[PDB]
Every structure is written in C-alpha cells, then in structure tokens.
Ligand binder design. Structure first.
Ligand SMILES: N[C@H](CO)Cc1ccc(O)cc1
Ligand SMILES: N[C@H](CO)Cc1ccc(O)cc1
Ligand SMILES: [K+]
Ligand SMILES: [K+]
Lengths: 329, 329
C-alpha cells in the first residue's frame, strides 16, 4: 500500500477532469507516475496557491515523482509579466515561498524536483524542437491554444504564439508521464496531446483542477494576521449559499486534503464545535444555515494563520525581506 | 584607389534601391564596408544566380568584406522547402556550386567568408535574442514582413512568422554594416531597420537589386550545351522590345559587369560584329532592330557556355555527381 487504486484516488480526487485514464492506470499498475506542475514566475504567490500545492501533496502521498517548474521564460513570453533582470529574483522568491508553503503543509521536500525553465529551454536540442514544432503548428492553432492562458492584447505579440509550444515541449524535456494544472490550461493540454506525437514524442496524461474561487472573491502569503482578518472580513460568503463560495472552496480543496477533517468553531449556544470528516457534510450544514458565515470564516482564519505562521517567520529576515522588495519594486 | 566615390559606384551600380546612403558614405570614408548576401538552401541554383554573384563581384572589387550565408534553417522554416536530413547535403551542393560560379567569373575566394545558418542560429545567445525579438514584434508585423518572401499558404505556419526575425538578427550576428538582396526582400529589410534598434542593435544599410527577368522567361548550372541552346531557343526576346527582356537583362546585370563590354556576334551582311562599352548603346541598337533576337541570343549563348564550362567540368566527378543526386532525389 498504497495500492494502484488508492494511488489513483489520491491523484485524481478533487480534479475537474482527467485526460488519459487508460494510460494512467497502465502506469500505476507497474510503477510510480512522473508528473509536473508549472507556474510562470510572474505575480507574488498568494493563498490561492495552496490549492495546487494540495494536489502536489496528494501526488507525493501517492508515491509520484513530482517536478515543480518555475517557468521564467514563459513569464517573459507572456507580455513581459516580468522583465528579464527581475526574472531571476522572482524565480528566487517563488522557490523560497513555494518551498515554504510545502513545508507548512507538511510535504516532504527531499523527493521533490525543482527546476527553472531557462535551465534547459535555451539548450540547442530544445531550440531545435521549437523550430521543428513551428514547422507543423499553424498560427491558428497556436493562438487558439493560449486563448485562456496568455494575456490577450489588441496587437498580439509573436511571443504569445510561442508560449503554448514551449509548454508542450516541457512535458518531453522534463520526462514526465503527466502534467497537472488548472482547467484553464485545457486548450494547451489538448494542443500538447495533438502535437507532441508529431515530433515523435508521447502524448501525456493531463490532470485538471477546477477553477476555484478565491478567498477574497488577495491574501498574500506574508500578510500579517491583521490584514488576513480584514480581507476575510469580506469574501463572498452568503448564508446558505454553497455555490461560488471561496471560503467553502478553500476548505474543500486545501483544509480537508491536509487534515482529513475540518473543525467548525461554533458557540455552545448554537451547538458547539463540530468536526466534519467529509466536505459534503459541512456543505449540507452550511446550506441548512446551522453553520454561520462568520463562524465558517473564523474557522478558516484560524487554520489559515496556522499555515502562514511558519512562512511569515521564515521571511522575517533581512535577506528575505530584501529579496521580496527587490523582486517586486 | 579605389576612392570612396569609386567604391560607392561599384557597390551601388545596377541596384534598384539603396537604403542608408548617409551611413554608407560615412563608412566608405574611413574603412571597408562589411556586407553579406543570404540564400536559403532550397532549390538547385540556376543561371539566374549569376545576377547576385555579379554584385558580390562588385563588392569585392570595392574592397568590401563579404560574407555569403547559406541559410539552412530558413530553408526549413519556409514551409520545409527542404527536409532537415537533406539540408546538409543541399548546403554542400550550394557551397560547391556557388564557389564554382564565383571562380568562373574570376572572383577571388580567399577573402570571401562562407557561413551556414545553423553554425550560430542555434546558439544560446542567438536564441535569447529570438525570444527578446518575439516580445516586441507583433504577429501582424511578422506576417507582413515576409509576405513577398515566405511561401504564402492557406493555413500559415508559425515557422513562417519566425523567418523575418531571424533574417534581421542575422545582420547583427554576422557583424555586417549592410545586407544585399533582391527588392523582394524590402519588407524584411525595413522590418530589420525598425526592430534591430529595439534590441539595442544598429540598423543596417540595405542594398536592393531589381527583380531581373530570367533567361527562360530554367537553365541549370550543370545543363549540357545542348539543353542551354534548346532553352534559349525560346526566352521572351521580341524584336525591338527592350522591356521584360531576359536576354538583355542577363547582359546588363551579368556580362557587362564581368567583362566591361559586350560583343554582338553578327554576320558581315548586317554590319559584322560590334563591341559595346555601355549597355545603353546595346539597348539602343536592339530597339532600332539592328541587333536581331537570334544574334543577341547566340551572343549570350556563347558567353554563358564560357561561364558554365568550368562548372560542368568541376562537377564531372563520381563524388559530385553523387552529391547532386543525393541532394535532389
Ligand atoms: N501556462 C502556465 C500558467 O497558466 C504556466 C506553465 C505551466 C507549465 C509549463 O511547462 C510552462 C508554463
Ligand atoms: N530571405 C532570403 C531568400 O529570399 C534568404 C535569406 C537571406 C538572408 C538571411 O539572413 C536569411 C535568409
Ligand atoms: K504565476
Ligand atoms: K535559394
């Protein structure tokens, strides 16, 4: 144990869609799945990142060989969401904060592989494949593949058209069996399944998380407890409304996978604390309005601060404080 | 001698247009001009290539540092006008036949620099510049820049959009002051003048030859004398018509620059042979119809076979015969 079935459950739970179930099961019957998740080194990571980090935790529990890609070249190709000089600083910021999040949720880092895009995306072999891919990929398909990912501007830049192709090639160069990302990556994922074979490379399994609403409808990973409270003070959390609820979503995608349970802090007057072992049970109580928005938020606030504490402490140094400012002037 | 003025004349004679006269004169007042001409390693070079070779001869006579680029990657990016496996064979064929043409017209090869695109177009520094360029070049401008150069197909490939940018970057990596090509390269040349400065590189001088009508309205450099005659037997050469005349054009752009004169072979009955020292004088006589199409063609046929003889002899070996067949199955 875990059995192939148990691994499949851990790997696919909470996902919106799985592409390649046949191959996925063939792999799990014999060996560990090789999978990666990529993130362009753009904006400062916020609490929403705990969502993909939770799936990464699931992959490791399932015995997967996991790689995290810091896509610095992609950040540059996406309408320069980060200058080339600041890219290296942002890669550092991302590496430090992502590792901090993983340590916070108790994910062993000794087995995770961290890689930067420019570590191999400028190599001759990779570049040759970019040109080979460009010879078969139509301008049309490239533009369509990145519609929901690359910033759409009035006068589209050539860089935006290259973006999808490099993400596809990353699957082969990182030597993975699968790629995990949000459902917003779907068009790039299908693009990769169609074109990698054209270059003699295998199509990969694709795991897609749903687009989860945020807690603030953003809470920075380094925000002080005071700001966390203030930002939570809002958040779309209407009584009895279980849809488009960022607070419930955070519990479903982050807290339950982490602790396997969720405790609602509630006054004795209204029933006292209650421990839920399944998200569906909590949702039922929220819909019945026996779990008040204020108590739901307070319960998440306590749990979130527990996740952020070690992170805020880690970055409480002159060096890291300097990096944060340098990476984001 | 040659003086800066004499060099400018040799460099610009017969051209349709010169972009950058100010800088060109500034350079010639102090040093030798660095210039290159590129050719994608696609179809088998034919007699029309003597036109650009004649300007290359002019550049060398003017003391220029000349580079000839065998653009193999470009041949691949232009709707695969040559597979990657055959590219190296075609580069070899091009190198051998272009050098043969230059030797035939008496151009010293010891000072000419021959370079293959893939010798540097796959380097990390060049690749980084391709991505930097892609961040500022719009899809629109890239498509527009190659309209008259890259094969236009129903479903445009991404490779076609990259083509112009690499040709622009070639100017910087080949470290030249200018680029020479046909007027059909104009949109790529203006594209390079606009975008290289965006990357901190200098705009280059651009020399453009007119689009010269061919002798056959194609005569291969290795065609036997019998086939040369047969193909010349046709050719658009109407009596008294000095426009769109491929025979007159070959004399103007190749034979006059080579010999500084042109001899018309004509029977005593019609005036006997006549030696012209200026193309305009020959054109006047052709317009007056005192130089018959048949005699004009015969005069060019004799001169052309003199140019092809050493080339046909050079490739009259088992090795080169094998290469020709291998490069073009
Ligand atoms: N497209 C992703 C951000 O939406 C980031 C990315 C993921 C995987 C890669 O191989 C490259 C970039
Ligand atoms: N575009 C040219 C053929 O029409 C070939 C070429 C010329 C110069 C270069 O740097 C690259 C390709
Ligand atoms: K990001
Ligand atoms: K060519």
């Amino acid at each position: 144990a875990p059995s192939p079935e148990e691994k499949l459950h851990l790997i696919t739970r909470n996902l919106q869609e799985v592409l390649g179930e046949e191959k996925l099961k063939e792999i799990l019957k014999e060996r560990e799945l090789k999978i990666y998740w990529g993130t362009a080194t753009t904006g400062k990571p916020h609490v929403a990142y705990f969502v993909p980090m939770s799936k990464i935790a699931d992959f490791l529990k399932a015995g997967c060989e996991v790689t995290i890609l810091f896509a610095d070249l992609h950040a540059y190709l996406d309408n320069m969401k980060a200058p080339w000089e600041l890219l290296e600083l942002r890669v550092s910021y991302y590496e430090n904060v992502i590792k901090a999040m993983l340590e916070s949720i108790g994910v062993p880092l000794e087995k995770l592989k961290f890689i930067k895009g420019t570590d191999y995306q400028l190599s001759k072999e990779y570049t040759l494949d970019v040109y080979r891919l460009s010879s078969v990929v139509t301008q049309h398909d490239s533009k369509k593949a990145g519609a929901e990912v690359v910033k759409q501007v009035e006068h589209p830049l050539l860089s935006g058209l290259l973006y999808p192709g490099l993400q596809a090639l990353d699957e082969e160069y990182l030597k993975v069996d699968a790629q995990f990302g949000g459902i917003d990556q779907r068009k790039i994922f299908t693009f990769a399944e169609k074109y990698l074979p054209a270059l003699g490379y295998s199509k990969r399994v694709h795991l897609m998380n749903p687009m989860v609403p945020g807690l603030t409808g953003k809470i920075d990973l380094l925000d002080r407890k005071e700001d966390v409270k203030k930002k939570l003070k809002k958040a779309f959390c209407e009584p009895g409304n279980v849809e488009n609820n960022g607070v419930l979503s955070f519990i479903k995608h982050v807290l339950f996978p982490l602790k396997s349970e969720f405790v609602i802090l509630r006054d004795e007057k209204w029933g006292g604390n209650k421990t839920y072992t399944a998200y569906v049970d909590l949702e039922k109580d929220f819909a019945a309005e026996v779990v008040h928005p204020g108590d739901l938020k307070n319960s998440v606030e306590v749990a979130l601060n527990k996740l952020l504490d070690p992170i805020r402490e880690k970055f409480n140094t002159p060096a890291l404080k300097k990096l944060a400012s340098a990476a984001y002037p």
